[PDB]
């Protein structure tokens, strides 16, 4: 083949397309993909803007930044789709005939499709994020389970002082969270206290989160529970990598994350940690309300072909292999023979994957042959539920059936006239919310002295102006 350029990160990791499913796609459908993200960048925004500077864009741009990625469709930077999809993209275009809600996710405003998204399996699966606790810790030091936020400040402090796992050190870091940048710390820790680091809805109302005063509550709260050594010390400057250290070295007590993959370290750990049990509660009640902000929204980015590729079939063809049976399970399930085999015509997960030797999540596993690679595509819950212990999956229904889960806000779209304007102030909003709520949490200041004056900061950036262009494209 020749070569194919792409932008590509994910999780901190520019694409490696010699990883297995890559491997395979190229055998598949004659695309040698080059990565013009290097190794060494770990950010995907500062890496993306770095990019946007050096010469000709790559052919394909694969961003996880879906506005800003529909922004550079609107300014000419990507080409629209929607004429190479019927010429050439028939698993696309049946794909779209069959979901008109994930059709109009791919439509802008201006009736260009200028990015396919990465969709979740978002009608078989909605809910993403859950709370868990030691129980086996509960049960060693006589507690009873912690069902409000003052409760559960209360059996942290008990698992920090009181050596719930036995070795005569203080050295449990009761609260911690799964992080490789600021504003996925604050999800984790904010939600807790009924606040958003992002934008929701409430009755029918757009709203700023880092604006609320739930949101100054919370970083007060969390401002108290850090000092206290109830919040993991480390909390900025750790990575992805966090959850399995504290739980494989039996510190972490308590998290919010991902009911699956969170779920799998019961086995995980088994012989590790005799008796380990991190157990999924409901969302803490703060005083009567017991909801949680946690859900997949319907994607998660996308990718799109620059003005600068020089052959936009062939890689609408790529786009579209990720849409067919083989390309879609290949995105899914890693391959056959290896990751999975075919019982009765579907994967069933190898024991690689599953029961991994190593200690390592069966998600993680999927990682490292580069499955679930966050580009285009559209995952499917069968893979998750492939792995998924049966306590994830009664987690699932448990969420579910209490009705605890908000509904995401919808991936808005912005018209030409207000997208740049929209995703500046966004942006530059973004950065005084991190950078405040950062030094809140870590102990300099004092959020009731400063509140103000951080508000008066996000107005002059555009608050209002940026509530306006939400609400009118909700
Ligand atoms: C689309 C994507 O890659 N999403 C990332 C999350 O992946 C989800 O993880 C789990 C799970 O951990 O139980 C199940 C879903 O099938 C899978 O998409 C990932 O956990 C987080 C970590 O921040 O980032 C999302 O980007
Ligand atoms: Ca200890």
Redesign the pocket.
Do not use: D, V
């Given at each position: 083949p020749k070569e194919t350029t792409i932008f590509a990160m994910?999780?901190g990791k520019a694409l490696d397309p010699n990883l297995p499913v890559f491997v395979k796609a190229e055998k598949d459908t004659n695309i040698k993909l080059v990565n013009v993200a290097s190794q060494n960048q770990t950010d995907q925004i500062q890496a993306y803007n770095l990019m946007l500077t050096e010469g000709k864009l790559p052919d394909i741009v694969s961003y996880e930044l879906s506005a800003d990625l529909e922004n550079l469709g609107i300014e000419g930077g990507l080409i629209p789709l929607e004429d190479l999809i019927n010429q050439h993209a028939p698993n696309l275009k049946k794909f779209f005939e069959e979901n008109p809600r994930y059709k109009k996710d791919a439509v802008a405003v201006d009736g260009h499709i200028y990015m396919i998204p990465?969709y979740?399996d978002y009608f078989n699966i909605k809910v993403s994020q859950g709370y868990f606790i030691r129980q086996d810790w509960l049960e060693k030091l006589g507690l009873k389970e912690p069902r409000t936020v003052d409760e559960l400040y209360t059996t942290l402090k008990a698992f920090r002082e009181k050596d719930p796992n036995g070795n005569g050190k203080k050295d449990e870091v009761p609260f911690f969270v799964?992080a490789n940048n600021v504003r996925?710390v604050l999800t984790s820790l904010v939600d807790l206290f009924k606040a958003s680091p992002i934008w929701y809805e409430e009755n029918g109302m757009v709203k700023y989160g880092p604006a609320q005063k739930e949101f100054k509550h919370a970083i007060k709260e969390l401002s108290k529970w850090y000092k206290e050594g109830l919040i993991d010390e480390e909390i900025f400057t750790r990575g992805l990598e966090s959850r399995d250290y504290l739980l494989s070295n039996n510190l972490g007590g308590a998290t919010d994350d991902?009911?699956?993959?969170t779920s799998s370290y019961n086995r995980n750990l088994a012989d590790k940690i005799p008796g380990f049990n991190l157990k999924l509660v409901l969302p803490y009640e703060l005083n009567g309300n017991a909801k949680t902000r946690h859900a997949r929204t319907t994607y998660?980015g996308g990718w799109g072909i620059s003005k600068d590729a020089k052959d936009p079939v062939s890689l609408i063809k790529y786009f579209d292999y990720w849409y067919s049976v083989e390309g879609r399970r290949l995105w899914n399930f890693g391959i056959e023979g290896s990751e999975y085999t075919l019982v009765d015509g579907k994967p069933v997960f190898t024991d690689k994957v599953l029961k991994n030797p190593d200690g390592k999540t069966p998600?993680a596993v999927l990682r490292e042959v580069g499955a679930?690679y966050?580009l285009g595509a559209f995952?499917d819950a069968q893979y998750?539920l492939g792995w998924a212990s049966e306590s994830a999956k009664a987690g699932y229904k448990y969420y579910m059936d209490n009705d605890v889960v908000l509904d995401e806000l919808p991936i808005l779209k912005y018209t030409k006239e207000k997208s740049k304007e929209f995703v500046s102030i966004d942006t530059a909003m973004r950065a005084v919310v991190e950078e405040k709520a950062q030094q809140w949490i870590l102990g300099s200041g004092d959020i009731d002295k400063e509140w103000d004056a951080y508000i008066k900061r996000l107005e002059n950036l555009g608050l209002s102006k940026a509530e306006q262009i939400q609400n009118e494209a909700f």
């Open positions: 994910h999780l990465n979740y799964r996925k991902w009911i699956a993959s998660l998600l679930q966050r995952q998750e």
